[PDB]
């Protein structure tokens, strides 16, 4: 009998066969949602030899006929973003916007926006839905910056997320529609009249005065996507985890200058990554004690890596004082986040205001009773209800 | 080994249990989510008789230490609103409240926040969550104007209900939280300076010039929160059956006339109450084979009522032109429904709004991948993603 994969949608929890699966096969033949068969890698030291062997493939993942973990949602190129982007003159204008320091304002942007949204919900009062009140428009507005779009269509554009983001077996006559949908809300923002100015679009349009509107729109509708989908859940998480153990909360009062250190542990720690990241192996390599044939599907358990004993000693506990923290939640190797110090930034400022703001957060039931979204490629409550 | 109950979250069909239960043990004892025993009744003619025999009590079921299907969210006397009601000369202001007739306006109302909400939704283009796009917002609408209130705060008021609604084993910190919460906000707009004249908070503060402050909010928030979560849940129901059978919504288009016998037929089958009707039983009482023990907790299935084949003709099969349908989706007995007819009112005007603005109506992916809420009164898809 073959394991199944995906592993368990609740995320509060190390899933108990992820530690099985590390333990015993940590290069694991597991069948996906879709019936097709993959090496699921689970040690540190196998997934990181994955992600920075280049014999394994993310671009091919997205190829007709290879086996998938679930159905693509998005044009096939769209996963090959980072390709395209250095390919056709892209990456300064990207690698430009997704840098916190050529925003000398974001810092401070982003944390009156932080405060804005708690200061409306310590007005109405406790309990309230952090999800919907707090990380979902403050991830929403990060990423509208990042675009230089208003903020006015944020529910609309999280709403496609939603979408978008769906793992599901088989590909579903919308995936389709819910793309050109949004495609199509880039382009109009991007071929404005008074031509758009900041962001993302701004140096698109200068460099189209100098690649087509959809490879444009392209870019910034999967950054706005995947950035959002990816801070949003990320930060969820690191809430259930200040919530649960309020002894983190209080070290971050006493000592805001830790925030850095506390973020990157929550990191290892968190388990918003409710699929695992992808590769085709383009030639027989040999990973642990299998042989893996080209053209096989493989599986990087990011989990799996980040709470292996063997590099992270006590890994199940949350440790703002590790010695060391090379943990994998940024991926590595080529296709390591790019975004990596921004995500880090977007999460620093939310949680520095939240401990600020709410001192006696605390969830408003017990964790066991979250409702974990299913279907998803994050693992996230639908609701993060809390008292203070 | 006693089944267990609840029965299934996924609502888009019968759960197999269900007619299981009530072919070979109408009246079977089992383990709600608490851990304490009940006596789940789950076939027509045993159902609307514990619904029709007042020795089976619906309000001591809030008292301390009787069984209990899942914690009291609310205080124990809100169990017994109507009584309450009644009891405090409350009942006039009340029932001229959820009387569609008394409110002239209703319908061209209810008609014009549907079509603003569906225009709303095909400016923006397919795919669409029904659900916060739709039957949320205008269940949301029709129950601020039902008590005389803005809805300017309406995703707040929903987002109590998110909590107050809740199937938890134990009681949780946030009930009483939330509850107090959304009081006070009735209280404020019943005291406000320029005194509500509009609705049930306006008979209400003409009432105390002729009960206390706490009472009547009392009735204001329960209201609203019962009546709101109901018929939107309710809605997204029947809209997955005319998403899921568009023949339904042929008929609809074809012959408008026939809305009223659609709902009730639409009523039958929804699977929108996600527990049972409690009740303690207040003396012993045979009950099909069964002896039920005076103190013992009994539990309507009403789904279970509503899909017997005794009654129903093929109950799996929805029929908007049954000769009869003495369906039990209201309850039965003392405690039908006092808002029935607004319930029915609430629908048909969305349901006739939907079918004519949205003709291609259909789910955005198969219907299986819908995300059923977890824990709570009722079922729902926590999502609605639909075409056009
Ligand atoms: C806490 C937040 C985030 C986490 C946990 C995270 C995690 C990751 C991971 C694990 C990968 C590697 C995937 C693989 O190797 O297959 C990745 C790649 C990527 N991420 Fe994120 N991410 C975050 C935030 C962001 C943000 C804010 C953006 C964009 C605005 C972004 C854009 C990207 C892009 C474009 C790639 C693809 C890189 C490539 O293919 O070379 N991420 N991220
Ligand atoms: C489609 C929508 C609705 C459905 C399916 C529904 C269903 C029911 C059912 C089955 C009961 C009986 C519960 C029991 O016997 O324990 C009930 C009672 C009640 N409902 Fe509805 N309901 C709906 C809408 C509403 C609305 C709109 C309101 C208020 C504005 C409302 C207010 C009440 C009240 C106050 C009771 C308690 C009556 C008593 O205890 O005597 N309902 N409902
Ligand atoms: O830029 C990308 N690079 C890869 C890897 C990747 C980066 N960030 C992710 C977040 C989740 C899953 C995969 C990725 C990819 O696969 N796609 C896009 C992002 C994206 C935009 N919309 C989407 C809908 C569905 C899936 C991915 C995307
Ligand atoms: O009026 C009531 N009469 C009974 C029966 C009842 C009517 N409508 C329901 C809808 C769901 C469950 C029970 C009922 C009751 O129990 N309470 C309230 C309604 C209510 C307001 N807030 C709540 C939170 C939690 C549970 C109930 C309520
Ligand atoms: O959750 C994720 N899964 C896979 N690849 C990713 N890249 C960023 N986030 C993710
Ligand atoms: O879903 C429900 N459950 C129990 N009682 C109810 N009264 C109205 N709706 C409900």
């Known amino acids: 009998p073959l394991p199944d994969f995906p592993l368990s949608r609740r995320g509060d929890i190390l899933p108990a066969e992820a530690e099985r699966l590390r333990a015993e096969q940590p290069v694991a033949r597991v069948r996906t949602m879709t019936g097709d068969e993959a090496w699921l890698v689970s040690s540190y030291e196998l997934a990181k030899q994955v992600l920075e062997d280049d014999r394994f493939s993310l671009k091919d993942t997205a190829n007709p006929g290879v086996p998938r973990q679930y159905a693509l949602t998005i044009p096939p190129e769209v996963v090959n973003n980072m390709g395209n982007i250095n390919s056709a003159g892209l990456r300064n204008a990207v690698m430009k916007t997704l840098s916190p320091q050529a925003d000398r304002e974001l810092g401070g942007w982003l944390e009156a926006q932080a405060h804005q949204l708690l200061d409306r919900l310590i007005e109405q009062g406790p309990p309230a839905d952090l999800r919907d009140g707090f990380t979902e428009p403050y991830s929403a507005a990060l990423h509208c910056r990042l675009l230089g779009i208003p903020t006015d269509d944020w529910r609309r554009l999280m709403s496609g997320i939603d979408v978008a983001f769906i793992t599901s077996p088989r590909t579903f006559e ?148 590790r010695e060391s923290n090379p943990h994998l939640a940024f991926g590595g190797g080529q296709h390591f986040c790019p975004a990596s110090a921004l995500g880090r930034t977007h999460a620093e400022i939310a949680l520095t205001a939240l401990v600020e703001k709410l001192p006696a957060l605390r969830l408003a039931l017990p964790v066991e009773q979250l409702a974990w979204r299913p279907g998803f490629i994050k693992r996230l409550p639908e609701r993060l209800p809390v008292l203070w």
Do not use: C
Request: hydrophobic share 45%; aromatic share 6%.
């Open 174 to 321: 919308g995936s389709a529609v819910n793309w050109y949908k949004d495609l199509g809300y880039m382009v109009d923002r991007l071929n404005a009249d008074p031509e758009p100015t900041e962001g993302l679009l701004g140096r698109f349009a200068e460099l189209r005065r100098s690649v087509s509107d959809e490879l444009l729109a392209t870019v910034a509708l999967s950054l706005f996507g995947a950035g959002a989908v990816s801070t949003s859940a990320f930060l969820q998480h690191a809430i259930i985890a200040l919530a649960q153990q309020p002894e983190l909360a209080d070290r971050l009062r006493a000592e805001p200058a830790v925030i850095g250190r506390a973020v990157d542990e929550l990191l290892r720690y968190n388990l918003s990554i409710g699929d695992a990241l992808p590769r085709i192996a383009l030639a027989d390599v040999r990973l642990g004690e299998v042989e893996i044939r080209a053209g096989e599907l493989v599986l990087v358990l990011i989990e799996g890596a980040n709470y292996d004993p063997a590099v992270f000693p006590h890994p199940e506990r949350i440790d703002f004082d």
